[PDB]
Design a protein around this ligand. Structure first.
Ligand SMILES: CCCCCCCCO[C@@H]1O[C@H](CO)[C@H](O)[C@H](O)[C@H]1O[C@@H]1O[C@@H](C)[C@@H](O)[C@@H](O)[C@@H]1O
Ligand SMILES: CCCCCCCCO[C@@H]1O[C@H](CO)[C@H](O)[C@H](O)[C@H]1O[C@@H]1O[C@@H](C)[C@@H](O)[C@@H](O)[C@@H]1O
Ligand SMILES: O=c1ccn([C@@H]2O[C@H](COP(=O)(O)OP(=O)(O)O)[C@@H](O)[C@H]2O)c(=O)[nH]1
Ligand SMILES: O=c1ccn([C@@H]2O[C@H](COP(=O)(O)OP(=O)(O)O)[C@@H](O)[C@H]2O)c(=O)[nH]1
Ligand SMILES: [Mn+2]
Ligand SMILES: [Mn+2]
Lengths: 297, 297
């Protein structure tokens, strides 16, 4: 459940926080709207685990595995078992056009998997974009009754290190690995004024990755609903945003500030971008793929 | 109101946050439980003002002016008018044993003051401690149906700089100005295990000042009820905590982590402590007083 009130912790022994020592001297750890930016070194996971366990927190994890992308599920789920929310209640939701192709994966106690059969769109752009509509629909159909928080990710990925309750908050986005160090004019926002996802060169906080966002079920429902509606308006106007659902996610989070922002520890591609010193851990990373081959028959 | 969901902001022009530049290099700006620690340089007040105005936020401010402390009201209120939550709805609650002695203070638009008549205790310790009971009682009688957040402060103080919506959150405490750089072993927590306020030497995050705390009405009601109840247990057991209400406030916030922590900018004494480099602003500060003279006939 999401408790309405602060919870009471038992006695705990851990190092005292140091007021006169910054937890990181190399990165921004809070946004100008006072949302934590989650980097290793900023959180004590034992405290957070207590707070969230005391509320019997249940986390849904949504993933789409349409057409050839069912091949990514085995490694995705096996690594999630090792690294994602261990110790907490987890409900995986695998959206797929091929229920029988979902691999058998042994789950830890308190963890379960639902397969949600959905239609496959022809264009990969549509498959990716229609995730917003499908997530929104199932929030009403299933998620509101079943989980407290939703975490919505790409399937062509693997967990390599801890991804836990430190990310949970009403609404979160994740710094895109290609742009965390970029100025807002280099951000690949949709720049056509006619698009609902339009963002001018003098606006923008961060470039958030479409591959990892989430929040309470109610906030994720609103975000996904609003993004879908924006895409439908664009469609009616003959427009498709440069980066599809990610463009609309960025517009949404520009205007509705997330209450936490995850660092690129949470969304990385090691082959493409290496391992900068600023990343103490690589938690959730790309799996090599041949885009053209895997996206088409 | 305290909106259920994130609000939508209009277009805004402000400097882009810099992921690879820490906002402060000299202080901790986030706790190990991912609560912001509020210092100048961590927040953009324009973004926060928009967020809270869109919710039509009403902030209540409680202050006790019992016996000779009515003398502090004029400067307290006149400076609050210049610096506290300007632009937002404010409801001052002045608890006093002398309603007729409350000074006439001119208020800006959207701001109101209520005088709550309460009993005077003989001992200054009891006057200070009974604030918990009194705030708790009025949370139910009045604050629940009248304001969104409550801010509870000492009266022997003046505002010298901005104190605004950046502090608002479900539950906040403030770093005591005397001890922000101290190790936990040095904190003047209650150390007798016979007291409900007991905290052993290997526990403690910060030493919070009893002169400035707050949060949602519901969280403040819980904190103040719990502190009063603990004080009554100690009294039945023949013990009074070393620092009275502050000792209990500290035990409470140790076990129920605050969702923001305010830096000593928000609670200072310049005569005692000067103006250290770590304080870029001095926002709410002690008015000199002769403790013995003002606390007794
Ligand atoms: C100034 C920096 C210039 C260099 C930026 C380098 C990374 C670009 O990244 C792409 O960025 C797009 C938005 O602009 C989409 O998010 C796309 O999905 C993403 O590629 C995906 O994520 C990537 C991390 C890779 O895994 C790629 O294979 C994926 O297709
Ligand atoms: C290692 C540092 C050694 C030096 C510490 C110097 C500040 C001490 O502070 C007192 O601390 C107490 C708890 O231990 C109570 O909070 C007391 O109300 C407070 O004095 C109040 O607040 C102070 C800021 C002053 O305004 C004082 O006049 C007040 O009575
Ligand atoms: O044929 C497809 C194309 C994409 N997707 C889903 O849409 C996500 C985003 O697509 P992709 O990973 O190819 O985008 P990229 O990361 O390269 O931008 C994938 O992770 C899958 O979950 C899918 O299931 N089948
Ligand atoms: O005779 C008194 C003593 C205490 N107080 C209230 O209790 C608060 C805390 O007492 P005080 O400021 O004297 O404590 P200190 O800050 O010195 O520790 C004061 O700000 C007043 O609001 C009061 O109204 N009358
Ligand atoms: Mn992907
Ligand atoms: Mn005082």
């Amino acid at each position: 459940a999401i408790g309405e009130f602060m919870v009471s912790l038992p006695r705990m022994v851990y190092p005292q926080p140091k007021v006169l020592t910054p937890c990181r001297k190399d990165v921004l750890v809070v946004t100008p709207w006072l949302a934590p930016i989650v980097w290793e070194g900023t959180f004590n996971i034992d405290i957070l685990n207590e707070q969230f366990r005391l509320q019997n927190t249940t986390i849904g994890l949504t993933v789409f595995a349409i057409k050839k992308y069912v091949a990514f599920l085995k490694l995705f789920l096996e690594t999630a078992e090792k690294h994602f929310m261990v110790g907490h209640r987890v409900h995986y939701y695998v959206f797929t056009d091929q229920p029988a192709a979902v691999p058998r994966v042994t789950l830890g106690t308190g963890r379960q998997l639902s397969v949600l059969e959905v239609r496959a769109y022809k264009r990969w752009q549509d498959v990716s974009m229609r995730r917003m509509e499908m997530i929104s629909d199932f929030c009403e159909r299933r998620f509101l009754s079943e989980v407290d928080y939703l975490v919505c990710v790409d399937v062509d990925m693997e967990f390599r290190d801890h991804v836990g309750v430190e990310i949970l908050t009403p609404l979160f986005g994740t710094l895109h690995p290609g742009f965390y160090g970029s100025s807002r004019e280099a951000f690949t926002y949709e720049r056509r004024p006619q698009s609902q996802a339009y963002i001018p060169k003098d606006e923008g906080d961060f470039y958030y990755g479409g591959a990892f966002f989430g929040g309470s079920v109610q906030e994720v429902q609103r975000l996904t609903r609003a993004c879908h509606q924006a895409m439908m308006v664009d469609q009616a106007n003959g427009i498709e945003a440069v980066w599809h659902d990610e463009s609309h996610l960025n517009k949404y989070l520009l205007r509705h500030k997330p209450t936490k922002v995850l660092s690129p520890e949470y969304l990385w591609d090691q082959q493409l971008l290496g391992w900068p010193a600023v990343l103490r851990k690589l938690r959730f990373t790309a799996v090599p793929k041949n885009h053209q081959a895997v996206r088409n028959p």
